[PDB]
Design an enzyme around this catalytic site. Sequence first.
Site, short mmCIF file in Angstrom:
data_model
loop_
_atom_site.label_atom_id
_atom_site.label_comp_id
_atom_site.label_asym_id
_atom_site.label_seq_id
_atom_site.Cartn_x
_atom_site.Cartn_y
_atom_site.Cartn_z
N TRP A 97 0.81 -1.25 0.00
CA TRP A 97 0.00 0.00 0.00
C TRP A 97 0.82 1.27 0.00
O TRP A 97 0.27 2.35 -0.21
CB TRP A 97 -1.04 0.05 1.15
CG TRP A 97 -1.85 -1.24 1.23
CD1 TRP A 97 -1.67 -2.30 2.10
CD2 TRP A 97 -2.86 -1.65 0.30
NE1 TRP A 97 -2.57 -3.31 1.80
CE2 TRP A 97 -3.31 -2.93 0.70
CE3 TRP A 97 -3.50 -1.01 -0.77
CZ2 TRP A 97 -4.35 -3.59 0.03
CZ3 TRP A 97 -4.55 -1.69 -1.44
CH2 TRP A 97 -4.96 -2.95 -1.04
N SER A 101 -12.75 2.47 0.18
CA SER A 101 -12.41 3.20 1.46
C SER A 101 -12.58 4.74 1.34
O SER A 101 -13.65 5.21 0.89
CB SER A 101 -10.97 2.84 1.90
OG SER A 101 -10.80 2.89 3.30
N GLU A 155 -13.69 -6.40 7.63
CA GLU A 155 -13.18 -5.00 7.52
C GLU A 155 -12.33 -4.49 8.70
O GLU A 155 -11.29 -3.84 8.48
CB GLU A 155 -14.38 -4.04 7.39
CG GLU A 155 -15.25 -4.25 6.14
CD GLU A 155 -14.62 -3.66 4.88
OE1 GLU A 155 -13.49 -3.12 4.97
OE2 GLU A 155 -15.26 -3.71 3.81
N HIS A 191 -10.04 -5.84 5.05
CA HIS A 191 -10.22 -4.58 4.37
C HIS A 191 -9.15 -4.37 3.31
O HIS A 191 -7.94 -4.36 3.61
CB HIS A 191 -10.09 -3.49 5.40
CG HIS A 191 -10.26 -2.11 4.86
ND1 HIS A 191 -11.49 -1.61 4.45
CD2 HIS A 191 -9.38 -1.10 4.72
CE1 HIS A 191 -11.35 -0.34 4.09
NE2 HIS A 191 -10.08 -0.01 4.24
#
Lengths: 527, 527, 527
Positions: C80, C196, C323, C436
């Site tokens: 990420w 998100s 999540e 998530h």
Amino acid sequence: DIIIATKNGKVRGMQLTVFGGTVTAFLGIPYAQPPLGRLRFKKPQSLTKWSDIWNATKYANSCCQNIDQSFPGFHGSEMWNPNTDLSEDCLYLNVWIPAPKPKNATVLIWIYGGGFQTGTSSLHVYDGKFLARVERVIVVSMNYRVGALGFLALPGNPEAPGNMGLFDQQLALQWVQKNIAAFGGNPKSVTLFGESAGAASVSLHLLSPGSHSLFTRAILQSGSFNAPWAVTSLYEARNRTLNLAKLTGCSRENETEIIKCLRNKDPQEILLNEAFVVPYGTPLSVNFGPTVDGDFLTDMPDILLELGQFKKTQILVGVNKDEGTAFLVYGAPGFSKDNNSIITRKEFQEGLKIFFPGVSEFGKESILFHYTDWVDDQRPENYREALGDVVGDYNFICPALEFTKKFSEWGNNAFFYYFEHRSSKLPWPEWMGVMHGYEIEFVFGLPLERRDQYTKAEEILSRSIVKRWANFAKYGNPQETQNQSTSWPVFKSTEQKYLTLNTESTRIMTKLRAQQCRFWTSFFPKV
Amino acid sequence: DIIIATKNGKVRGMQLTVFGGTVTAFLGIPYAQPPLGRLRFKKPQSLTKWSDIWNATKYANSCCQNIDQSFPGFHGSEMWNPNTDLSEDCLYLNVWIPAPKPKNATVLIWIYGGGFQTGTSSLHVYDGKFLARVERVIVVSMNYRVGALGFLALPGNPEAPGNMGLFDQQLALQWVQKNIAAFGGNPKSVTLFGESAGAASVSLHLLSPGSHSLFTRAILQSGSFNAPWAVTSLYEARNRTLNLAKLTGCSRENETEIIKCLRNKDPQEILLNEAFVVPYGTPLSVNFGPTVDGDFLTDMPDILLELGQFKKTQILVGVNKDEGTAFLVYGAPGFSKDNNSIITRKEFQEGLKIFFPGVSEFGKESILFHYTDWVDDQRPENYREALGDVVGDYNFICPALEFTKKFSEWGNNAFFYYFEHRSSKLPWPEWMGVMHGYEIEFVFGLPLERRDQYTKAEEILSRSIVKRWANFAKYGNPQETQNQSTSWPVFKSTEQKYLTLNTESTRIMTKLRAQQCRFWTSFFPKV
Amino acid sequence: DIIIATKNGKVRGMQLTVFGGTVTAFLGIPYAQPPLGRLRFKKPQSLTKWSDIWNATKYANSCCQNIDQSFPGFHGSEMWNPNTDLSEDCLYLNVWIPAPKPKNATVLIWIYGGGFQTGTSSLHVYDGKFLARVERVIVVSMNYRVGALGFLALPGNPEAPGNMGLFDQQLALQWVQKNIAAFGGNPKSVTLFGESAGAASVSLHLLSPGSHSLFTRAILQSGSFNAPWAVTSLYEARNRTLNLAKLTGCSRENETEIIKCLRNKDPQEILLNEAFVVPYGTPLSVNFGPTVDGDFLTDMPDILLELGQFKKTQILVGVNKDEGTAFLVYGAPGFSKDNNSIITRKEFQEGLKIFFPGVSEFGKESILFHYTDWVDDQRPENYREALGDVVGDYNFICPALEFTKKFSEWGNNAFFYYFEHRSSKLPWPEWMGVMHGYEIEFVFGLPLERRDQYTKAEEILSRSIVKRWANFAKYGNPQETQNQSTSWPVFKSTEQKYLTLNTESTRIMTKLRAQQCRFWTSFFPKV
Ligand SMILES: *[C@@H]1O[C@H](CO[C@H]2O[C@@H](C)[C@@H](O)[C@@H](O)[C@@H]2O)[C@@H](O[C@@H]2O[C@H](CO)[C@@H](O)[C@H](O)[C@H]2NC(C)=O)[C@H](O)[C@H]1NC(C)=O
Ligand SMILES: *[C@@H]1O[C@H](CO[C@H]2O[C@@H](C)[C@@H](O)[C@@H](O)[C@@H]2O)[C@@H](O[C@@H]2O[C@H](CO)[C@@H](O)[C@H](O)[C@H]2NC(C)=O)[C@H](O)[C@H]1NC(C)=O
Ligand SMILES: *[C@@H]1O[C@H](CO[C@H]2O[C@@H](C)[C@@H](O)[C@@H](O)[C@@H]2O)[C@@H](O[C@@H]2O[C@H](CO)[C@@H](O)[C@H](O)[C@H]2NC(C)=O)[C@H](O)[C@H]1NC(C)=O
Ligand SMILES: *[C@H]1O[C@H](CO[C@H]2O[C@@H](C)[C@@H](O)[C@@H](O)[C@@H]2O)[C@@H](O[C@@H]2O[C@H](CO)[C@@H](O)[C@H](O)[C@H]2NC(C)=O)[C@H](O)[C@H]1NC(C)=O
Ligand SMILES: *[C@H]1O[C@H](CO[C@H]2O[C@@H](C)[C@@H](O)[C@@H](O)[C@@H]2O)[C@@H](O[C@@H]2O[C@H](CO)[C@@H](O)[C@H](O)[C@H]2NC(C)=O)[C@H](O)[C@H]1NC(C)=O
Ligand SMILES: *[C@H]1O[C@H](CO[C@H]2O[C@@H](C)[C@@H](O)[C@@H](O)[C@@H]2O)[C@@H](O[C@@H]2O[C@H](CO)[C@@H](O)[C@H](O)[C@H]2NC(C)=O)[C@H](O)[C@H]1NC(C)=O
Ligand SMILES: *[C@@H]1O[C@H](CO)[C@@H](O)[C@H](O)[C@H]1NC(C)=O
Ligand SMILES: *[C@@H]1O[C@H](CO)[C@@H](O)[C@H](O)[C@H]1NC(C)=O
Ligand SMILES: *[C@@H]1O[C@H](CO)[C@@H](O)[C@H](O)[C@H]1NC(C)=O
Ligand SMILES: *[C@@H]1O[C@H](CO)[C@@H](O)[C@H](O)[C@H]1NC(C)=O
Ligand SMILES: *[C@@H]1O[C@H](CO)[C@@H](O)[C@H](O)[C@H]1NC(C)=O
Ligand SMILES: *[C@@H]1O[C@H](CO)[C@@H](O)[C@H](O)[C@H]1NC(C)=O
Ligand SMILES: *[C@@H]1O[C@H](CO)[C@@H](O)[C@H](O)[C@H]1NC(C)=O
Ligand SMILES: *[C@@H]1O[C@H](CO)[C@@H](O)[C@H](O)[C@H]1NC(C)=O
Ligand SMILES: *[C@@H]1O[C@H](CO)[C@@H](O)[C@H](O)[C@H]1NC(C)=O
Ligand SMILES: *[C@@H]1O[C@H](CO)[C@@H](O)[C@H](O)[C@H]1NC(C)=O
Ligand SMILES: *[C@@H]1O[C@H](CO)[C@@H](O)[C@H](O)[C@H]1NC(C)=O
Ligand SMILES: *[C@@H]1O[C@H](CO)[C@@H](O)[C@H](O)[C@H]1NC(C)=O
Ligand SMILES: *[P@@](C)(=O)OCCCC
Ligand SMILES: *[P@@](C)(=O)OCCCC
Ligand SMILES: *[P@@](C)(=O)OCCCC
Ligand SMILES: [Cl-]
Ligand SMILES: [Cl-]
Ligand SMILES: [Cl-]
Ligand SMILES: [Cl-]
Ligand SMILES: [Cl-]
Ligand SMILES: [Cl-]
Ligand SMILES: [Cl-]
Ligand SMILES: [Cl-]
Ligand SMILES: [Cl-]
Ligand code: NA
Ligand code: NA
Ligand code: NA
Ligand code: NA
Ligand code: NA
Ligand code: NA
Ligand code: NA
Ligand code: NA
Ligand code: NA
């Protein structure tokens, strides 16, 4: 002094005193080139343009047309005869406006009846000044060609294409579109109304694509195009047009040549021959009327109605309690206006023969069967009343009801009335009852005129119809909201509510002439 | 003499005598540049412009295409063979108009069938003069490219993008949009109709964004794009296009180069090879047809249909009682047109093998199972009838019914017919029944022609279909309103009413081939 | 070589080989003036114009932003982290198009998440080439400003008006409107999708008047603006903006002067301070996010949602089974990714303290009460699972469900999914479940890539989601029509059907987390 600049140039009107106030009238404004010489039988053509001020201060020429001579001197017939010079030069219209000039008034356009063979906007019972004074609406009416000169058809060929009188009307509606705002009119709020052939004309404007955008809504009094006298077939139209040539020694080879020849005949010779282009007429003959020309009318109207091809809008439709009677003294044996006309079975049968000439024996037996199981007392007036009902039901009431069913099934609001008041001033005898044509004076508000002696009740009834018509025109809904009146429900299929207009008891009823209309509508057309 | 100025210049037509009146025919008006040399396999390109008067007085070249030689001299097959010179120069169309010229006529556009491999607008059974005379509609038809020359695809690459024949059609529809008002046509009232591959073409125009605004509504006779012969996959399209190159010694490296090479071959060499680009065909092979090109078709049609991406409008869809039969004499063992074709179980199984070549043994057992539990008597014609039904149901009736369900679930009016009259003049033998293709003559109104000896009943049936088709086109609703006919109800899911068209008893029925369509529609696609 | 003339001038892309075919990629096309110096904190301004050809052949600078350093070297977190240079010069976007260039492709616009503090379009799991290859859709993504540099607000004052990052997005959507047809795109068929904070951005575009006409429909994965981390109040926004000035020694008097001062600080000093503008954060802190600015957002979003002020269109909304889990290893005591994290009651209570810092004792007791009546066995994993559910339900699932109820009550079609497949390749431990963020790779079609070893089942699941997303985008309806899949019903209030996406058994279910959402939605907001 009052002058309005139109698209064709200036016009002057006169001031009228009505009911304590004023109305401005423009009488005889031209709306098309005079259809003379080479324009006879042709579609109307548009106005040249003019310098100077046109004086619209008197009614104009009525169109060429035969006159009813069955009762010379009798106010009952003669009130329908033309009250101005007959001429070929007759395409003019009248405008009546409120004083002071309004700002965006709703417009009422009247189209007269007369079988497509007679009529004129200048008649006393069509005087728009009262509606203008009382409702502050603008009232327009026009002269359109009638008889052969208006409806001669030689299919496709434009020297005589058919429907010229309907196109005169359409061209006057256009004149309203282009010019009426100068008079204070709102072109976006135009209601067509008319009676008899005038009412069938209105129903055809609903079907005509060239008319779609020339009005908002419509009122049909005792007439619709599905009535059996309303539309001539192509077959019978040719037979007639060639039969006319033959009679005037105009039989030729080249079709255009027959028209060219007929355009050389004098109006009177054509008028004199019109009556005989048919082996046998009835008192309901329309020798020259609307046809399917592929132009004003693009297909047969039954099909258009049934399949929903017409302007979507609100309509107001109605009929009178004794539509048939007026026709019986123009041919039916043992009928007179000067006596009670108690007739025999044998007279009645002969009667059917006059009214249904080309119909089979069985067909005629079938009417007799449906209309003579009484119910029951050996009343002498039995047969006289049945012949009136036969003619009324087949020619007016039933076709009017069917048109209303058919039209409302496509989703629009419709209102149906049944006028059952006999005028206290009627010159025809009592047995003729609530006659064809005699709701008109109520709609134009003649009984409102104090110094004319209608009854007080007639004044009040008229005041109430004038209001419902005007509310219809302006707002799509024919209610009288102030004096706590009977609310007028929409006519739906299934329920089929109608309103009764009378001087006493206003009522909501259902399924007018149910049994009779099954007969004319489902059984009789097969015959 | 009759000359119409179009957007590309003048054209002259001829006068025809039809049924006591006249029709004006313009035969062979070009609508695109000839697609020759460097334009072969490319989308059609628009017309240059021309000085002088074009003489549209004879039918034009039919498109290049193989001919059926299975029955030389037999009117039953030969009536479908092209009746003008074959040439690559074939993008022309015909117009038939009423006389006198109408004012805003509804327009009927015919798209012929022939498996996307054959056909031509100049056929006798597609002559539009009758529809024009009787219904006063304007009738258009066009020639479009067929076989490889019309449907060769080498994906994305514009030298051969796919669907050229569909784009020829689309470009003719456009020509109608720009020019038809000069002929008296109303471009806003255009109905597409066609049969077989022509009917699948019509169904694809409904799905094509470039077509949305080029017509109003649609008629599908025995065809729809979800039929299993209608759309070639990209996979099989490449395999085919490369297989063709290989056969003509055009196998190259650079794809454009393969097209350049194929554009140097003579039409006959390409025609001669088309048949073999497939390891094994059936009598239902469409070697070169519609593909998903990302242009005319933007996704697979099943998806578009299912998710509701298509033109919202009314459709008329129908099929014939014995669609399958005509195919059995083009390969099925023990079938002949010259005898009754009583076949054995063993023949039937072999039969399935001809019609379902790439299908698993089980798949074939499954058809046998569904179609041979009779019901019951030891009738000899059992197996012959079942093989016809198998081919009809899978190829025509079932896909037609499913297309109609799917289309009406998105809210629009649909009408379904089941044609079950065998022409008295049919040259194929009685056992072949109500064959594929033989409702066409009824729709174009051939039996109306007095001096042709169809029966009186056939004349009346034809008169009634011609009217329903025309009413559909003009008004969205296929009723015959005058002669008190059986009203045709809309096809909804759940009820699924259809109308039977026959010479005797016209009927409203429900759920055509219910049991059979569950088989083809829900079980067979898994196999 | 491939060059497209845009409204700002030419750009060159590269050719990619995907899955046997080709995709054209334009990476790093600028869409706004670089927001540096005097443009820092200001709304984006439009592009100058350029001579020469822009080389869009590599990803561009990601926006300035702090990096996650909790797991250095761990692929689970580091996947990420931004994979290009950080710079203030970061307003660029990417386009991926099918080869051959399509004609009117539907457009997918991706908006990444990262709490409004982190993220970048150049990440591996956002690579659009697969969607373009397989579905022939065009895929766009853009970089937008995050953290203070994107969401600093000093109310009304335009030197720092708020929402700059949302306006960067809006300005890229515009760039799509003006330019995408040159790439073969259909500007009238644009679907926004994001996950998100990206999903909350999408929900705000639905509410923003400046966005109404810049897209057609919307897809929200695990996010909506009514989530509790999504919108900063004006109160807390000022407190924060002034707290930042104080920390950077920028506290002044005149507000413009504070901005002028902050525009002189170096990016790193601002990044270093952002964390502390709050007395205490949680692992769900959004220190700088969307605010109600009276410009992009014209009122508080709860009100707009409740009273129906937003774009009427179809939405697709969904969430993942676990999540909450990913957040517990960023602060919750006794949680680790390197062990099973079996926690005690006492740890759980402390846990609530980390996640609900400013909430009353009673408020916290109330969560404990709702989430610890089991049901029942003395399972050790009881408390660990409940803390995940607490965080998931409050932050994602419940707000997503409520947004879907609220939106569908105004009449539009909505579809809800519940993703419950744990990737076979997940580097986080098994107890963290279906985490998530980890449906993204499925939506972009990474498991389609043969040489990457996802399972065969994962390939098939991905193939099926890619199809549903694409069908949604093109046609408003997320069905997989070919492979006989479970039909996805619309989400209505009352019934509230959702679809489960898993590798085994796809199911229709009702009322997801009913009991839990009553708690978060009706009781907890009072507290
Ligand atoms: C009502 O009158 C009719 C109509 O004809 C008559 O008109 C009357 C007013 C009267 O003055 C008379 O001179 C005139 O003939 C009568 O029917 C007629 O009956 C007469 C005499 O028997 C016959 O010669 C006729 O065939 C027939 N006339 C017509 C024109 O049809 C009718 O008898 C009378 N009815 C009554 C009094 O009830
Ligand atoms: C109906 O005809 C078929 C078709 O083939 C035949 O065509 C006939 C009209 C006849 O003139 C004949 O010469 C020709 O072969 C018959 O099937 C055929 O049976 C023949 C003879 O036994 C076999 O040699 C063939 O395999 C088979 N032919 C084909 C083309 O499949 C069929 O038996 C006959 N059916 C009847 C009379 O019911
Ligand atoms: C799971 O790990 C946690 C987290 O902290 C630990 O990380 C481990 C992977 C381990 O290598 C260890 O060195 C590291 O402290 C454990 O909670 C911790 O328990 C320790 C030792 O008793 C305490 O000192 C801490 O307060 C607490 N750490 C934190 C960061 O909160 C946890 O006990 C362990 N759980 C198991 C094995 O179920
Ligand atoms: C339309 O065509 C003929 C035309 O004959 C007519 O000639 C006209 C000029 C006029 O004078 C008119 O009186 C005359 O009818 C019609 O022929 C009639 O039919 C009868 C037979 O029933 C014959 O005796 C005549 O030819 C003629 N009638 C008379 C009284 O002489 C024809 O009937 C008509 N077609 C219709 C109504 O459909
Ligand atoms: C499409 O690709 C090949 C192409 O082979 C073909 O070559 C063509 C030019 C043509 O002549 C055609 O007859 C020939 O089929 C197909 O290969 C066939 O498959 C069989 C195996 O079942 C092999 O024997 C051959 O390679 C070939 N057939 C014959 C009879 O020689 C291939 O089947 C096809 N793909 C499809 C239908 O999906
Ligand atoms: C917003 O306003 C004040 C600002 O005080 C802050 O100064 C910042 C620059 C930053 O360093 C931050 O750590 C500090 O909080 C907040 O005041 C806090 O409240 C507590 C009382 O609970 C006091 O001890 C301090 O003034 C301060 N905290 C600390 C730890 O020193 C204020 O709470 C905040 N308002 C909110 C969150 O609504
Ligand atoms: C119209 O009438 C008036 C009367 O006042 C007159 O002055 C005018 O000349 C008239 N128009 C004519 C006679 O053409
Ligand atoms: C009259 O009313 C119409 C609506 O019925 C309106 O559009 C038109 O402009 C008005 N004209 C005026 C007030 O002059
Ligand atoms: C007949 O004469 C007309 C009018 O003069 C002419 O124009 C037309 O062409 C002629 N038609 C026929 C059919 O002879
Ligand atoms: C309503 O009421 C009064 C009498 O109370 C009457 O004079 C007037 O004419 C009525 N108006 C209408 C429209 O009928
Ligand atoms: C079209 O046909 C007519 C026949 O009358 C002729 O005069 C004209 O030249 C023709 N066009 C040609 C030969 O190109
Ligand atoms: C033909 O009809 C259409 C409506 O279907 C209309 O809009 C068009 O203007 C008409 N054209 C004519 C009468 O020439
Ligand atoms: C192949 O040749 C064509 C046509 O001459 C050329 O324009 C194209 O660029 C070439 N393509 C490849 C992939 O070699
Ligand atoms: C309707 O009726 C007549 C016979 O009564 C017939 O000749 C005519 O063809 C029919 N019209 C249609 C459209 O079927
Ligand atoms: C874009 O890349 C190409 C590589 O073929 C190069 O020719 C061109 O100059 C590049 N643009 C630059 C370096 O600005
Ligand atoms: C693309 O499709 C739209 C409708 O979604 C259409 O209006 C537009 O003109 C099309 N553009 C093309 C085919 O270039
Ligand atoms: C503060 O300074 C700014 C920026 O220089 C100036 O334009 C503004 O008018 C001043 N405002 C106040 C309230 O003193
Ligand atoms: C549908 O079916 C085939 C297998 O029969 C599969 O390979 C293909 O991926 C599927 N398509 C979609 C969109 O799931
Ligand atoms: P209205 C008096 O115009 O119509 C009656 C129908 C036959 C002349
Ligand atoms: P129609 C005769 O065009 O189609 C039959 C389908 C297979 C050729
Ligand atoms: P997503 C990972 O953008 O949002 C989580 C909300 C708190 C940062
Ligand atoms: Cl009565
Ligand atoms: Cl008797
Ligand atoms: Cl009742
Ligand atoms: Cl059957
Ligand atoms: Cl067996
Ligand atoms: Cl049933
Ligand atoms: Cl769960
Ligand atoms: Cl406790
Ligand atoms: Cl439930
Ligand atoms: Na009268
Ligand atoms: Na009254
Ligand atoms: Na009655
Ligand atoms: Na055929
Ligand atoms: Na029939
Ligand atoms: Na059946
Ligand atoms: Na994430
Ligand atoms: Na699946
Ligand atoms: Na649950």
